[PDB]
Amino acid sequence: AQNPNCNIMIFHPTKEEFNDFDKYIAYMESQGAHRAGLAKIIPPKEWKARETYDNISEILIATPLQQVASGRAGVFTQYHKKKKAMTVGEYRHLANSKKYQTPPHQNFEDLERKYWKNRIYNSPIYGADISGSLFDENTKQWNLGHLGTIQDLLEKECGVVIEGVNTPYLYFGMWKTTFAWHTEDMDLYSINYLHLGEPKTWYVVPPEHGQRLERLARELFPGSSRGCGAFLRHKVALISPTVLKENGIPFNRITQEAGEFMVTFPYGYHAGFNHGFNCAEAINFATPRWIDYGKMASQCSCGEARVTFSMDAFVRILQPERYDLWKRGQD
Ligand SMILES: O=C(O)CNC(=O)C(=O)O
Ligand SMILES: [Mg+2]
Ligand code: NI
Ligand SMILES: [Zn+2]
């Protein structure tokens, strides 16, 4: 078996290998990359996402989110308080202000220590889930707005045509902005490109050990667990690497820098934080290997999760027994 320790693998495709997206994902899996839950892909030196990022300041962040924490330094939840709209130029200025800027630090490890020590005492503002793309339309390789759709994948594999669309989302981050422990909707893959700015640190649990993380989360967030059998779908819970280690949860960590792709694999729980002002683009995707994960994916039906239009068809076709209950949660 390839990659039996479930390490995060890093790939350096050639420009020739970068032509066929599906083929390269399959190649990574042939080397055991999926066992980690997360892989890094460094594009060939000849590739670029777009010419320059000099003209992005007029993008609107319609609903910036202030991420307010509750709990203890290593075990906390966050809720999202809506703020007034601001442009990316305004957001960048805010990120760099004394109140929100990255503190002096020695290296990534020092900054990581500061993050887990101090995160809960601040409330950074995130521009998340903004529909759009920063890939040049002429970028032919690994253009996250030109991927084969999940709906077409499901049709190719299972023969059923379904409604729905999926398009990329932009994320504008600042120091301490946080993504909570989660797997993707329907345990899909995701791919994330860091366009510009400061790094993003990721934590990930191997898919084969995801239920260990779930069990710990139930113990650490007991009220939330009683409220919903899939409350990590709410994407609000954080658990530090120290607490994971104390509880014997297998995980890995890696820092993504500007110009690098990360792929998360089906049922790979992940969480992380931004180092400073940055912009990432991400989208969900599927492969034939995803279908069995989609069939088995947990669902939130308590009403909190509330997801995209396109998830309806996924649940309807892959999980018909769960569909009625899930849809009640939607409404
Ligand atoms: O970048 C973020 O804030 C969150 N991204 C993801 O969870 C992802 O790409 O799957
Ligand atoms: Mg602009
Ligand atoms: Ni994700
Ligand atoms: Zn729920």
Author numbering: 11 to 341
Question: What's the paper's own text on this?
Answer:
In this work, we show that unencumbered views of the changed, non-ground state can be obtained by recasting the problem as a multi-data set, 3D background-correction problem, which allows the relevant signal to be extracted from conventional single-data set density. Our new method—Pan-Dataset Density Analysis (PanDDA)—comprises: the characterization of a set of related crystallographic data sets of the same crystal form; the identification of (binding) events; and the subtraction of ground state density to reveal clear density for events. We demonstrate the power of the method by applying it to the most demanding type of changed-state study, namely crystallographic fragment screening, which attempts to observe in electron density the rare and often low occupancy binding events that occur when a relatively large (200–1,000) library of weak-binding ‘fragment' compounds (150–300 Da, 100 μM–10 mM)1819 are added individually or as cocktails to a series of equivalent crystals. Applied to a series of fragment screens, PanDDA yielded markedly more hits than manual inspection of density, far more quickly and all with high confidence, in both known binding sites and new allosteric sites.
Z-scores are assembled into spatial Z-maps, and clusters of large Z-scores are an objective and statistically meaningful measure for potentially interesting crystallographic signal—events—such as a binding ligand. Equally importantly, Z-maps also make it possible to identify weak changed states (for example, low-occupancy ligands) that do not yield strong difference (mFo–DFc) density. As ligands—but especially fragments—invariably bind at sub-unitary occupancy, we generate an atomic ensemble model that reflects the crystal content implied by the density correction: the changed state modelled from event maps is combined with the ground-state model, with initial occupancy of the changed state set to 2*(1-BDC) (discussed in Supplementary Methods). Incorporation of the ground state into the model enforces our Bayesian prior knowledge of the crystal, that the ligand is most likely not bound to all copies of the protein in the crystal, and a superposition of the two states is thus the most likely situation. These ensemble models are indeed well-behaved in refinement, provided the ground state can be easily represented by an atomic model.
